[model samples]
Target chain A: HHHNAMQGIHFRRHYVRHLPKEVSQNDIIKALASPLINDGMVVSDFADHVITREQNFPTGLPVEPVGVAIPHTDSKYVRQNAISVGILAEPVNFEDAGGEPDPVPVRVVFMLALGNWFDITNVLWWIMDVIQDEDFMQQLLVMNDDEIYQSIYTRIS
Target chain B: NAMQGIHFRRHYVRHLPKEVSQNDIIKALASPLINDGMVVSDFADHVITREQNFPTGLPVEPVGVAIPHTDSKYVRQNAISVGILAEPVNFEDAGGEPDPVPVRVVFMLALGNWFDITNVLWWIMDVIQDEDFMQQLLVMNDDEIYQSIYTRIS
Candidate 1:
């Protein structure tokens, strides 16, 4: 994957002050999409499309302890190749992909901005790698916001 | 998701002679499957070319990664084969990170044109996320290698 813009991949931890005790999948998108706009990965158009894709594909996976929402848009909307990671301390709620009634609580959010499918794959692979690591997962589960941020940023660099 | 329990679900073999190069790994991998007619010569070429251009090695923290794939036109069946090497192989990773990450296990996947690439990726990400599992796979002998993986997934 092109390393030029590809290197800016981030892992962030923010207060998310009042994340509803039970947040929905829509909440995950808003949290992730807002940062993307702040970081300038996508224009205003990208945010709407991100929301649209979430409803359709609902990137949330079906099984896990702390749920995760992977929000990505079609490759063309991206100006560069970057995989931005944000972990919510508040654990937002998302419609259970496998059908749980109370909605699911998610801690990890991966915001993908890419030029194409392959680029997304490159970033996703690494993101998936981290999410899959048990030791890493434990650390994620325990860390404060900044520690989580450093953990993500340190992985790629 | 795979209903049965694996992405690369074929009977796998391991530890070819240490002399084998990257091409050797490719040939060794394609041979038995070829005997079964699972792939063609052009398929091998496509797989190799894609590796050169895209170079699937990933930079996982504490480990380097490799993802081997080809365009769908070359495969005879949509299946996956897992391979393990007793020693590490030198492979390039993204960002020009030039350390030869000891990749002892190889997951060879053959997907149909309709197979979603993201799905394949998501699954592998889950399987490999388990570091104990990754370490166990890397150290196991041939007999243990296949059995361990099969059992874990099962």
Candidate 2:
């Protein structure tokens, strides 16, 4: 039987937030990585890899109704699979997936630390699926941490 | 637009040939779905390119899975065409890792204008989340796979 790594993947409620409009991608990663590093699910250098990797091979997607970005790096820096999402007060620009040069205005960012690379595709599919609806994306922005967790939990669980 | 669950017209396959490549499997499964009015001809190409650019291989436990889909504009109707390979095939990891993941099950998605492509995946995840359920799907006959997945969503 395969290990259920998805079970270990949980959205950090307190870490989910609405950041100030001036926040940069580096700022966002640093803010979100704080708790994860403290919890030992990720190495302290995890944020640096996320920033470096995102520059070379971007993960911004023009997925349907709402444009979103999934910033992640190799599994080596991760001790456990976990997710931290942020809804920006104002959208930020990111290069599209596969290192495309064009910029996509992303309102929400899903920062993933996946201990298992195999789970990446499924997690991506889940995000791409839900963000297709503008209404759903709006609901996510307004929802509290508990609501956010349940909203994502029910869909991806 | 009425939100209707996607309907699969018994277009499920099992134990694909060992030598079949990813593109070959996409063409084989997508052709009938296209002819059946579930999708358009460009679907085959869209899915292929998307998979190439952003590989969909999942690393679940005992066996891994791959899901290939493209923009919904090519879709005429919503449906999932399933393919279970006899031997696992090497697929690039979606995480941008250097190594490739071996995939045993492939779910080719044909999403339409009405149904959110995301929700369809959620339903699919329900099946994948349960390792025991995924194992059951692996051994099930084609019809059984069709019924089980259809019932799970419906």
Candidate 3:
């Protein structure tokens, strides 16, 4: 079967089971980036920088009932066709865009390693709408590690 | 520009030309507002600065469009200036996103004192929702592009 290119879009329903109590922000990026790397979407040229930049400036969208972390890096860093999702077991402090000092305590993060920006209109709103669902979020936050993959797979289906 | 009220007299803006400057085009489409006394001379610069602060690139490919505008405080009226580029131009996106994919179309809007920033943003958003309009835009000649937008939006 031909893969849906939009399959590159992903969601992680808060499935972090055993994480460190206070890991650095790089640790989070590492978790998100390593999967996409294995899936073959981004070059390693800017891998370290991705995590570093996230630590310095976190992407926290806090506009509603449920909020999320939006992580992205320049397309130059990628070499493959992949997207990644992650959940934090413990809340980590990161600043919002525009140099705001207030720490954004994020529990969920979606890293977009885009190869190109086509038909992306549905992607953003899709993620936003999904995150706004409380029942789905509950499943994401509480699913077992083995069940995580199925949860995401089933939701998209 | 007049000082009583700002308006986009639809009858006036049906004459934009190909290869027009973004600044001049903004002045022409927004002339209705100017006549009604809605815009200050600094309207164009205000819109340009707003672009610097919040790049308005939509989620599209090949020809990523950027329609920049500002609040009516800087403009004489509530009007939108539409411009078609002779050639695609590259624009730096805000939020440190990648430099945009090339832009073949640009709509620099200058709102009058009555419309909020969201009104203008949402109007563009409404247009982007139409797939037929977008595809039509890609193949349209300059004059057709102008007429089509006016017809579709109005």
Candidate 4:
């Protein structure tokens, strides 16, 4: 019953990365936003919007075997719907969706630039499903940037 | 990533009492989840705060609804808690940003792991997809809600 809407969206393999161990949220956001900004899929202010929004509404989820975050801004700033994946060298602190005072350490980050709310639900739910596979997540975390891109590309395609 | 071999329980509030706010519904429903060791004490606060900023309310057919879930570390098990508001409550819409959707049904997820998150979401979507089922859920009593869920999955 879930609309497998992960397909059709673009992912810039150049934007996907294995960030440094002590990276901050902004660091990851900057990395993911780089290709988007260069490609003009998002406004220059896109990263700022995402950072501000996430500060108030944290997206960290403690999925099995690892914690991850999906940070995105409103579609108004997005020229198209796309996703960027980042695997951290080490887990970085992020506020929990449950609103805990202490932050959660997230290992994976999914940076999304959705065109509208329709793409929002479709893509987010698809990630929820994708992460359920412990094997997939484990493989995803260890894969090189090129491999990680292929993995996600295959799933959505 | 994907964990397997887990089945989620169905939690629901068939008929919401009048004038209950979103906080009211979350606290009432989350209490059981906490008491049952399904979630942490702070689940309610987190859900509300996130809702205020992110707004989980959606524009769907029959009656628009919201699906609220929080961090998994606070969760001890997997369950989908359903609350059908007695009267529609104004919830910030995920789709209708800056405005509100008159939400009649609510789905709050308590997932301890990512294993069954996708499967459970699809199941909930299945019910929402079936217009007749959505109507039935709106009026179903506690027992009927439970029964309907049972039939849908198994």
Candidate 5:
């Protein structure tokens, strides 16, 4: 489910649960970053970098039918290039990445831990394609947690 | 020559006068580097051409920014020209979808090679995505802006 020598980039998925129909962005970021850090894919300070970077550059993109957030930080904090995905059990508020004051109720999270600019852009190009498709997102919302990783990773690789 | 010890190559930064269109601003940024022999004469033209293919307008905090450039062949050395627009200039969103983003700061890159493009471009993303940094660029004078970016840019 990962790579050796941090070859290129890798992918993984996690199941998330939030109560009261509301979730803090901080909690969600930690849930995703913890596993990647422990697995040696990212540095111990990985979560802090994501949190700090997000405060400066929020990744909330408001797509129709469902919203998506891509939270990531500098390459220095990553041990291996990886993409960890989290599909929120329900919508959580994320500020608009475009610097707008509007709130985006994000349902899916793409925590991109990339090692280079080229890699970030490569993944971003396809991500725009993925987010625009309402049918595809809805399908993932219904599938098993393990399948979510394969479904997106298959297309990305 | 204060920081001759600072190995960072010199880059131009200016508070651009309000231009009638986007093309004018692109040239205003590149014209200096061209005259200095840091880039080819047609560098700005190539930048204009690439904008249509892969727009680099980003909507960051307080305002938007645009990073415009083309292939490495048009460059003689790796240098960046930053323009703080007198008025918010429009550009196609690099993130895709949003049409004609109103950009307050513009970065015109003249990279001599692909290696510079990959590395510098990543740093460009980091600079723009930072809300506090973008805010400073707009408010600071041209000298201040030059120092602010080069300290990190180098």
Candidate 6:
């Protein structure tokens, strides 16, 4: 009974944060990555891996209301499955996922720390379902810290 | 890691038209299903709509590929159509990055459920990055294109 509720409480503590402001992607990545490290869900160099991976292959997703970025590295850098997200105060420029120069103004960042138990396709589709909902994403951009956590946690658990 | 019984409802397995516009290519690909009863009247239109909103263009290896699909309601039966051309057709990047990618192969997927749609999408993305698979798809003759990919879904 209470066991499930306790687990839910622990789950929420692992990830998700309130990012007041960040001019660059680096600040957002580091801000989100720090929580995963303290939880022991990701490696120490997880942030670095994400940065390099983004350089080679960006994760800019185009969604209405606002664009979002999903930055992640391989499973080798992950100790457990966790998704760290940051709601930005202002949109930051993220390089296009492809080789193109057009940057995406990312308002939210979802950094994935995935282990072997994870299914990338299913997880991606779940995110797609969330981001594609223009009304939901629009609501998300304006919502505050508790509202953001409540909305996202509603999706995961 | 494998999902079988995904027999292609339609395989254009032959070469697609050359020197034609992207709209023409889409028609050429969707006409067969429209002529048949596999899909309804507005199926092709839905494909164009989805393409415009979220492009299926993948800037793969030496040769790029386009995977265009639409909502399941438009399709009555689950089918896969493969199109190849001598002169590549230009499609917008899947990332919406504004780069016009020249796609030589087009995989027009008419999936009936999220399960099949999501699997094939990941399958397409997973395999394309491999140099060998891209070579096999690009180098092989148009008629034999299904030979390599048929086993992938099975």
Total clashing residue pairs per candidate? Answer: 5, 4, 17, 6, 0, 0
lDDT (10s digit) by residue, model 4, range B16-104: 79979989988777776777777888899988876665667766677877887775667777766778888888777654345677888
Question: In model 5, where do residues sit more than 4 Å from their true spots?
Answer: A1-7, A13-22, B1-154
Q: Estimate each model's TM-score.
A: 0.63, 0.53, 0.47, 0.55, 0.52, 0.51
Question: What DockQ, on C-alphas, does every prediction get?
Answer: 0.14, 0.05, 0.05, 0.05, 0.05, 0.03
First chain TM-score for all predictions:
0.73, 0.88, 0.74, 0.92, 0.86, 0.86
| lDDT (10s digit) by residue, model 6, range A1-157 | 1111111222354366667663478878888899888888889989998888776567776554698988888777888777887888888878655323577888888887666312443356456658767888887777876787788777655
What is the model-wide C-alpha lDDT for candidate 1? 0.59
- Second chain alone, TM-score for each candidate: 0.78, 0.88, 0.65, 0.85, 0.87, 0.85
- Candidate 3 residue runs with Cα over 4 Å from true position: A1-5, A8-18, A52-57, A63-67, A98-101, B1-154
In model 4, state the lDDT of residue A57. 64
Whichever of 1 and 5 has more DockQ, that candidate is: 1
Find the 10 residues in a row with the least total lDDT in model 6 chain B: B1-10
Candidate 1 chain B has its poorest 10 consecutive residues by lDDT at: B1-10
Task: For candidate 3, write residues A1-157 as lDDT tens digits.
Answer: 2123345444443322334566666777777777666555677644586765555445665523344666665445656534466766766665553234466676666666655332222344345546667777667667766576676666554
Report the candidate with higher TM-score, 1 versus 6.
1
Question: Largest TM-score belongs to which candidate?
Answer: 1
- Tens digit of per-residue lDDT, candidate 1, span B38-108: 66665656667666655566555444446676765676665556666656675556344455455555665
Give per-residue CA lDDT, model 3, range B13-110, as digits (tens).
Answer: 34345565545544554555456555676666666555444445554454556666665457644555555555655554422345553555566655
- Pairs that clash in candidate 2: A2-B61, A2-B62, A118-B59, A129-B118
Q: Per-residue lDDT of A14-55 in model 4, one digit per residue for the tens?
A: 868888877788988888788888888889989898898777
TM-score for candidate 1, please give it. 0.63
lDDT of 2 by residue, B1-154 (tens): 1114566667655557889998988888787788888888778988887777667776667778877877667888777788888888887765445567788888887766312433454455556767887888779988888787667555
Worst 10 residues of 2 chain B by lDDT: B113-122
Compared with the true structure, model 6 gives a TM-score of: 0.51
Per-model lDDT: 0.59, 0.72, 0.53, 0.72, 0.70, 0.69
> What is every candidate's alpha-carbon RMSD to the true fold?
5.7, 13.1, 13.0, 12.1, 11.9, 15.7
Candidate 1 C-alpha error for residue A115, in Å: 1.9
